[PDB]
Amino acid sequence: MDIDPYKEFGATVELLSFLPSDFFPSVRDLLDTASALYREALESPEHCSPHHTALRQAILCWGELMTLATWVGNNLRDLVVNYVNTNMGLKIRQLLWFHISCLTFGRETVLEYLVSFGVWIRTPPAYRPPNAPILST
Amino acid sequence: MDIDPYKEFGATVELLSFLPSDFFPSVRDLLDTASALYREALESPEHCSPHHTALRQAILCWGELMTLATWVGNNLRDLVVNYVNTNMGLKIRQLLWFHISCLTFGRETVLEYLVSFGVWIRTPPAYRPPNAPILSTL
Amino acid sequence: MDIDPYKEFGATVELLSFLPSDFFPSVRDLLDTASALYREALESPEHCSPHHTALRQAILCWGELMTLATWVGNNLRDLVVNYVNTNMGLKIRQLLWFHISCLTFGRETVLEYLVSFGVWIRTPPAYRPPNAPILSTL
Amino acid sequence: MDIDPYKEFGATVELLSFLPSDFFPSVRDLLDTASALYREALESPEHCSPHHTALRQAILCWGELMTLATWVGNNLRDLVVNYVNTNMGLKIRQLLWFHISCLTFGRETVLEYLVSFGVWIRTPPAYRPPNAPILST
Amino acid sequence: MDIDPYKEFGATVELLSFLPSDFFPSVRDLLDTASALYREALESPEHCSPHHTALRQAILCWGELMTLATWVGNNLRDLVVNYVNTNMGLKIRQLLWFHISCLTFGRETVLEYLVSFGVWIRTPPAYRPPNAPILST
Amino acid sequence: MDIDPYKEFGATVELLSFLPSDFFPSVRDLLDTASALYREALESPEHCSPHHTALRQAILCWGELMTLATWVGNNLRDLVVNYVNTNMGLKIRQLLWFHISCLTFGRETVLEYLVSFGVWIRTPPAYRPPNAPILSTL
């Protein structure tokens, strides 16, 4: 079956395909952003939103992938570090970026950001404004 | 930080720890159970439960884990598959079994069951009833 | 003076002497069980029960012995640990079995269980029914 | 699992470390004091307080600590006797002093005294009441 | 004990860890900004906000640190000037920047600025807009 | 500019000047007094007083000052410690004592006390009562 990670949140994997690969900050930057803002909330047992629930799972799913990559790098191997942190870690960098942005800025603002980034990224460089659109408030 | 994936649901990882390894069916058998009788719920964009939101992530995580075992397979190598499906896949099977059971039976059926299994399995086998507590709809 | 710790709970150490000594599961199995579903209430300052109040003191007493048991194994040696975790810890496992089950299953039900299990033990084994009485929530 | 045994009684382990350590009368004196005038209440099958329940564990814990320290002194062996009266003794000696005082004077009288006494010894002697405060009924 | 300087003001030391070290203007720039805007208010004995109270203390705490660094540089030593004005003075540059910003722009705007800066600072440089977000009104 | 840290509180630095050096306990003894019986207030994010806001800054300032004395210690050197804890630490001890006293006793108890100590200590010892005015709850 084809479980769309985003479809319940009003987005889709085609919609985050507007964002480039090297747009997402690294996993360490996301987790610090999650820890500085929602450390009491993610470890809270209260349901405030399903954004928290998809964030708790994705943090632990990254905790598995570093553990397996540690297991490979100690038993089998430097290419594996290059593979996981780039080609597999991008999908974690999508899910971490999405729910941290939705909890901070609202679901509605994020979905309008993906369209507004889409205009920017489709625009030819000669007519593209110099700064990328960035989320705030 | 330390995040308990069950703490939302009135359960803890210690409560799920008393279940043995073989209590869980194989990882394919959970996903087939998910895909057969919750597929119209999972692929729907409706938040029908916090379980459904939580459950979708587990498929996507396991499909991510099997991507690497496939990758390490034809790049380097089969001992890795013995490590994932056995040692690390149990955490997926805990995760998959728990939501599917809470979706099929309710939380209250499962959360009473994990206690009643806990008092069962902690008892030594000389004093233990020979039949394990099964999970029923009551 | 000799204080019976179970006396104020409708029990006595006679009634817990019905149980065989190996029936009580290991200390880690009890401590994880109180950490499973009572970790909130134990660290809570709310007087919820005397069973809480007793159980807080029993954990801290248990952690105090292991602090001294590792001290002798650091400064004098594991026969000491073999002495504690068999003989003095057996009295500790009696409390941790007691108050956990009285909170989880009701104090009245536990007191009936001690009587009902004693019937099962004092029955000669050839006429003993194969299932043991065990606590659950049916 | 971090349990502060005084937290339900409106104190902390820190607030009882706030007193000087030699302030606390000896463990033998505390065991005789509860046996003097609470012995019928401790042997009673009816708690009149959670203090009674908490205090009954404290003898039975200290029965275990003296048993083990005896057992080491039977077969090995006197470092342990001084050690258990250095760290393990003081924890019980705070604990036995607290509930015996709470059953005698009430909680609020004790808890105000703990604040009052530790300020008194942490006051320079020329600018304080001359004699130490002591508990009043 | 771990006294968080910011926790009562809705922020935390993890939240100002989003801001870089060389983002904060020097102590002389903050004190002139405090003197040009709040000289009558800081020396006023009226409580308008606890932001004033934490600002009066932090100004005097900097007045101590320059006095001690003057004392070292005249009695013991050029490395000390490099140490205090960088590694110790940063924490004063945090507290001075925070309360001057909160008194001028509102507490709510400052806390939304730290999140909005966090997006900017986590963003990869190729997709980062050229100007940093800056407070106004 | 010149900022009086006490002017908010109905006191001045001149009013706190009449207190001698030895009237204040040692700096550890103030912080231990703060940490023992106001720790749940200070570490809470609630503005319960302007004193609590003011008091938190003093710990953080003293921890900043002791960072340097530790730094000058293992870099260069012990005469500096004699300068901080004695000459400059008194300004911390004035600051720490004042809020802790105003929290424990009220402002009005302290502000009457600093006057009654002022008329006491300004009087020469031949005419002075031999007992210092102590600070009491009245």
Numbering used by the authors:
A (entry chain A), D (entry chain C), E (entry chain A): 1 to 76, 385 to 445
B (entry chain B), C (entry chain D), F (entry chain B): 1 to 76, 385 to 446
Please quote the paper that reports this structure.
Hepatitis B core antigen (HBc) is one of the best established VLPs, and has been confirmed to be a safe platform that has seen use in both animal models and at least two clinical trials. Heterologous antigens can be inserted into the major immunodominant region (MIR), which is located at the tip of surface α-helical spikes, or the C-terminus, whilst retaining the ability to assemble into a stable particle. NadA is a member of the widespread bacterial autotransporter family and adopts a trimeric structure, dominated by an extensive region of coiled coil, with a small α/β domain at the tip of the structure which is distal from the outer membrane surface. FHbp is a lipoprotein that binds serum factor H, as an immune evasion mechanism, through a protein surface which mimics carbohydrate ligands.
Processing of single particle data showed that the T = 4 form of the capsid predominated. The density at the strict 3-fold axes is weaker than the pseudo 3-fold positions: this indicates that the NadA domains may retain their trimeric state, and that the flexibility conferred by the flexible linkers is better accommodated at the pseudo 3-fold positions of the HBV core shell scaffold (the linkers do not constrain the NadA trimer axis to be precisely aligned to the capsid 3-fold axes). Only minor changes in comparison with the native crystal structure were seen: the largest change was a reorientation of helix-4a by 4.5˚. Interestingly, the spike conformation appears stabilized by the base stacking of Trp71 and Tyr88, which could play a role in stabilising the NadA insertion. This may be due to steric clashes which could de-stabilize the folded state of the antigen domain: limited space on the interior of the capsid would constrain packing of adjacent CFHbp domain monomers.
